[PDB]
Structure formats: structure tokens, C-alpha cells
């Protein structure tokens, strides 16, 4: 799949316009794995994750569910 998917219906990451946002980014967008179903990758920026939240997510073993799937996971 990769860094340049359309990760969700409102995805705003584009290989033709992307620039760094998070302090950990250089040339590629930060991504996080959503554990819904078979699993899929989303761009952290498209989820509106703050840098602090993203770093905490990356440092732990808790599963993440993206904005489209978290309501289903908590039901």
C-alpha cells in the first residue's frame, strides 16, 4: 500500500503537495495502524492527531482505531 494512499474519505496527503508537519517527519508522512478488521494504515495528520498523542501512541502497545472505525471498536 504505502505512504501515498488515500487513507480515508477526507485524506489530504498528496505526493504532489506534502510537506513536513510533525517533528519526526522529514520526507514521508507519519502513519499509524488501525486495528479494525484486517487492519489498515492511515496518515496521522488526516486523523487530526496532535504530535503529543501520536508520540504516545507510537511508544506503547495499545491498539489504535482510526476516526472511521473507533465507534465500532468501542461498541
Amino acid at each position: 500500500s504505502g505512504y501515498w494512499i488515500t487513507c480515508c474519505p477526507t485524506c489530504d496527503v498528496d505526493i504532489n503537495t506534502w510537506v513536513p508537519f510533525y517533528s519526526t517527519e522529514l520526507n514521508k508522512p507519519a502513519m499509524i495502524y488501525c486495528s479494525h478488521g484486517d487492519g489498515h494504515w492511515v496518515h496521522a495528520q488526516c486523523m487530526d492527531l496532535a504530535e503529543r498523542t501520536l508520540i504516545h501512541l507510537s511508544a506503547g502497545s495499545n491498539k489504535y482505531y482510526c476516526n472511521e472505525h473507533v465507534e465500532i471498536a468501542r461498541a
Binding site: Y3, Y22, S23, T24, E25, L26, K28, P29, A30, M31, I32, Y33, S35, W41, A44, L54, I55, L57, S58, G60, S61, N62, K63, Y64
Partner: peptide, 9 residues
């Protein structure tokens, strides 16, 4: 959670 591009430079 698994992530990409979250390592401190």
C-alpha cells in the same frame, strides 16, 4: 500502536 516516521531525528 504500530507507526511510521515517529522516531526522533
Amino acid at each position: 500502536a504500530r507507526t511510521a516516521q515517529t522516531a526522533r531525528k
